[PDB]
Amino acid sequence: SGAIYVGNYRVVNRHLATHNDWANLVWEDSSRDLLVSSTTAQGCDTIARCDCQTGVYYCSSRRKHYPVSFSKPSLIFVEASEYYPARYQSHLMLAVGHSEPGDCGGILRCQHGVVGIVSTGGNGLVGFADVRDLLWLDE
């Protein structure tokens, strides 16, 4: 679990969005596993606007942060799950690091701010949904 709180927006994994997220829907994209809902309170976070390919992510299944080198956002094949059929997920970045399904929502940050959230993984890999191209989150 986990979310990004920036301005009057809450960014979560689309497959983990609540009834309240959908009732306050701003934007969603199944191909990216992202959903953004509106909030009444002002949020705590800064979005990175950069091309970093290194950063640190929070891994809830270890209660620890880990440094990562990650690929640039791209279209990656993701196997069918209970949430989606087998499909290409866009704007996904992969790295070597531990992850389990419940780690989705953990933030990836570089020195400039929030880069994305955990969205996929397995076998010593962790995948992050990029949010750096969503300029409207703070504009």
Spot the catalytic one: 33, 45, 103, 130.
Answer: 33
Question: How do beta strands 25-29 and 107-110 pair?
Answer: unpaired
Measured from the Cβ of residue 128, the count of other Cβ atoms closer than 10 Å reads 29
Is 54 one of the binding residues for ligand A1B4O (CB under 6 A)? no
Is 49 one of the binding residues for Zn ion (CB under 5 A)? no
How many whole angstroms separate alpha carbon 91 and alpha carbon 114? Answer: 15
Binding residues: 50, 52, 110, 112
Active site residue 44: no
Measured from the Cβ of residue 97, the count of other Cβ atoms closer than 10 Å reads 22
Judged by CB under 6 A, the residue of 35, 36, 119, 130 near ligand A1B4O is 119
Residue 128's nearest CA partner among 137, 115, 139 is 115
Is 26 one of the binding residues for Zn ion (CB under 5 A)? no
Is 50 one of the binding residues for Zn ion (CB under 5 A)? yes
Active site residue 104: yes
Token duo for residue 64: 């620890």
The site for ligand A1B4O (CB under 6 A) is made up of 15, 33, 78, 81, 83-84, 89, 99-101, 103-104, 119-122
